[PDB]
Symmetry: D2
Subunit: 268 residues, 4 copies
């Protein structure tokens, strides 16, 4: 019997096999969870990617900017998991900011239309997914979202950092709503992970100076972390998400759990 | 000679004589500052209100959602203060959230179109005003915005709290940009102030339960504050803003100064 | 197989069956851990109390102010667990402040001799236990201490709050040292728990006003917590400690995990 | 008329002309304050040093570990400032940690006798000076202490960081007591300043690796600070202390004001 034996968990945010959500899904299945996946836009690709997970998982389309996708989401989940069953967990692993809001593009030059799209996808959608799915979640259930510590400004991340600050605030209000259902809501603040997008940025996709600054940020992270930090290994992040989905942190909600090697607790 | 003798300071956000910005402007003029005011929408009213300030102050129209107002703002300020002169200070005292995002209206029921408007006005505009005016600000100058501590969720304030979380993040990035000009950027986190809007909310304009919850929040504030808190007296807040506009906190930037009676430092 | 199957864990701090450490020990044994217990002063009582745990556990004497107890502690643990074996976990559940430092006795009237004793037992000993036991802890092991959120002042807790602030700082340095051994160090910040000492304080053992203030603090905690807070039930706290002792938060160190119902994330 | 015109302010902590307190005293006198100084141990030296201040200031002996010095302090101040007069301000600029608690000496190897002495001088004395002097402080007065941000661990500073964490907690309780007198209590968190002691440490007085680590910490501070940081110039710190001693932050108490160039608001 695994950490999540028999639990029904919805996992958003898989796009490649380097997505943090891919490893969340893998570890959850290793620990006995039965998954429902949601994917955005490139559903043929996502299906082929998730064929590599240890167990079969039904895939549902979900664009979090599409009010109609959200209005049907709960019914579509029930079609998959069966009438009379509910979800035990919800993983939000969704983030986006248009290029104008990141990289070497000046902070002041991001038009609000772009910033607003990034905040819609990266922060507001944490509330609207909770709105859609709380009516079909069991008492004792768990909502978990992915965070990148925005308490201090940093180069290049720019308006994505602002979106994460908003997300942390949203999580504290979602916890108030979720508590009425006996459900917890928490974020995992991860250290940097070399996803396909992050590797491309370090390669210069958003400008050379931005790539240079993000590379220096990654190096200092492993240096500061008392137990080190391996940006090529998302398994410690996936395990921490699974910890929050289990019943082993039953009095934690509205909160942020750091899976970052301890880097944020050290100055140098 | 006053605390701000001869300094040229732009003050946004006056709408009535109970606006926090009205008292910021009054105290700044008492301390020798020469003001330029900006007003939104109801310019005849704002002119009549600000006739009551101790000294004459030119009034310029500024809707922070209007890109054309922002694109001409610096030139219009220069017309007023004179070619060859620059601003020494910028006060952002602007906030708005549509009713769906506050009060008894459920947190989950605020459509993103409404939330996005509130974040545009209450958070993004801190960056876009800095973008407009930094080119005409003197070294040693000071940008100050108004904050309401969003580190914990609270009843009724709902998505306005999320907007303040975003604003605090924006301020840390504005400080990075402003530092290139020798300019500081900081927020003042004020305790609750009985503006006309807040009195109406306590009177029930956003629902009875929301009025009840905000009234209880005000009462606990004075109880927790080691030096007390008078929501009917914005002068301590105005004085703190003037402190940040002066040269007496010359090594503080990207930061938040609490003018709240000490309430946030006490649990009970 | 339990969450802690086969792990060897040292648990300090049991004095009665309402001690938080008693429930940590019970849950750890329920999850397959093999325990070594340490007790202070009243070893006959502690032996009789811990006879009620689900499994036998050897008991060692440890006064954390006694340098000789600490200098022999590792050897005495090895005698119990066997040459060639090491500990996988260390639970610090130790706190004390003389009466002058708590309650209605004025904050200014606690002599430093008393405060220093309380800081020795409640904060410094977290470092000196780590110094004693890290040489016999396995890579991947876990040190966990008990915290009560001291980020804001509160009535009655007085100098115990100061000792907890010191403890949080000590934990960040212990994490630096422990990382060299592949060991994590973290605190669990618990909500209030009705131990025998806390029930006596609420009954007035430290003065009537202090009992009144602590009772009001307990009530507001359950009110603020989005999932509620039951001060008569330490099991959620024990489970959270066991979570940190397991391998399921492998990238968290130098950190504080809140097992408080979410109360610290809400203002009202 | 200066910022502190006519105010009577007690200033502790001068030992050389590079002491932060020397520059606090200089700026306060430049702004019209009438000072009383306190000095520890080397009173002939301190007298000769403070002969260089712009105005004469009476010097009183105060060892904060000496209960008799503290028990007579208020009477000795009244002898100097005149019967019927009170203090308007109190500056605590006192810190000490024995060598075992800093530098390359291992964190675990500092005996508690040494740590306790450092916490007595650096943290507890903030409370005991407030206890001594609040009875002779005017309503509207101000107590200010010097802080070095201890929210994250760092190399070399070791147990001094723990003492600063305790000091921040003490300040929140002193604010509760001081509020009964209408007095504010706050800390200024300064960036690193090249005092004589700090120059010697960088020169290796506490070991080569500790000097190397502190030098790297200083360099990163100026790099992170959006307005830069000059460790050879304590005037911005002195000005910030004077700001808190004035009436221009009248609603701030129990709090920490950062005079650090904004460095703590930036990660890289
Ligand atoms: N270093 C890092 O990679 C890092 C660090 C900390 C936190 N995080 C966060 O982890 C989460 C997962 O990101 P990742 O790094 O695994 O990258 P990723 O690119 O693999 O995943 C981002 C996902 O967001 C999805 N998404 C984008 N727009 C969407 C929309 N309109 N509707 C639905 N889904 C949408 C994409 O389809 C993709 O699956 C994000 O919140 C990210 O901010 C990442
Ligand atoms: N208790 C409180 O009142 C409280 C507490 C802390 C902080 N604050 C903040 O102080 C600031 C001032 O608010 P207030 O309480 O004085 O209320 P207010 O209603 O008097 O001022 C709000 C101002 O925002 C302006 N504004 C709205 N939309 C605008 C737009 N599109 N363009 C330009 N200006 C626009 C309004 O015209 C008005 O002048 C706000 O940021 C508010 O969040 C208020
Ligand atoms: N509400 C609460 O009870 C609460 C809340 C949060 C955290 N905590 C913390 O949890 C921990 C356990 O306390 P508890 O509430 O279970 O109370 P408790 O009285 O049951 O346990 C305190 C323990 O400290 C031990 N101790 C005292 N002096 C010692 C010494 N010199 N050497 C060794 N051990 C010594 C006592 O023997 C006792 O076992 C403490 O750190 C406490 O501060 C308690
Ligand atoms: N980089 C820095 O120098 C730095 C940074 C931030 C904060 N601070 C703090 O500023 C304060 C002033 O330190 P400084 O850097 O100016 O160094 P300093 O050596 O010039 O001043 C320290 C003072 O503490 C006094 N002191 C020590 N033991 C005492 C006792 N028993 N009784 C009374 N006074 C005693 C000394 O006599 C001396 O005047 C300290 O709290 C220090 O921690 C310093
Ligand atoms: K490291
Ligand atoms: K009060
Ligand atoms: K509740
Ligand atoms: K810099």
């Amino acid at each position: 019997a695994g950490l999540l034996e028999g639990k029904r968990i919805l996992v958003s945010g898989i796009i490649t096999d380097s997505s943090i959500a891919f490893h969340i899904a893998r570890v959850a299945q290793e620990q006995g969870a039965q998954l429902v996946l949601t994917g955005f836009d490139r559903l043929r690709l996502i299906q082929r990617i998730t064929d590599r997970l240890p167990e079969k998982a039904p895939l549902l389309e979900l664009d979090v900017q599409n009010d109609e996708h959200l209005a049907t989401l709960a019914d579509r989940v029930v079609e998959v998991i069966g009438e009379g069953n509910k979800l035990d967990g919800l993983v939000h692993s969704i983030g986006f900011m248009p290029q104008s809001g990141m990289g070497i593009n000046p902070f002041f030059d991001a038009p609000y239309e772009d910033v607003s799209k990034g905040i819609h996808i990266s922060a507001y959608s944490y509330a609207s997914m909770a709105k859609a799915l709380l009516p079909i979640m069991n008492r004792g259930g768990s909502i978990v979202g992915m965070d990148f510590d925005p308490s201090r400004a940093m180069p290049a991340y720019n308006w994505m950092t602002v979106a994460k600050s908003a997300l942390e605030s949203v999580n504290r209000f979602v916890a108030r709503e979720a508590g009425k259902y006996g459900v917890r809501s928490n974020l995992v603040a991860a250290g940097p992970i070399r996803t396909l997008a992050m590797a491309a940025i370090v390669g210069g996709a958003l400008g050379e100076e931005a790539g240079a600054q993000i590379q220096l940020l990654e190096e200092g992270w492993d240096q500061r972390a008392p137990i080190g930090w391996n940006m090529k290994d998302p398994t410690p992040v996936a395990k921490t998400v699974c910890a929050l989905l289990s019943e082993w942190l039953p009095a934690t909600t509205g909160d942020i759990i750091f899976a970052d090697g301890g880097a944020h607790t050290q100055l140098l």
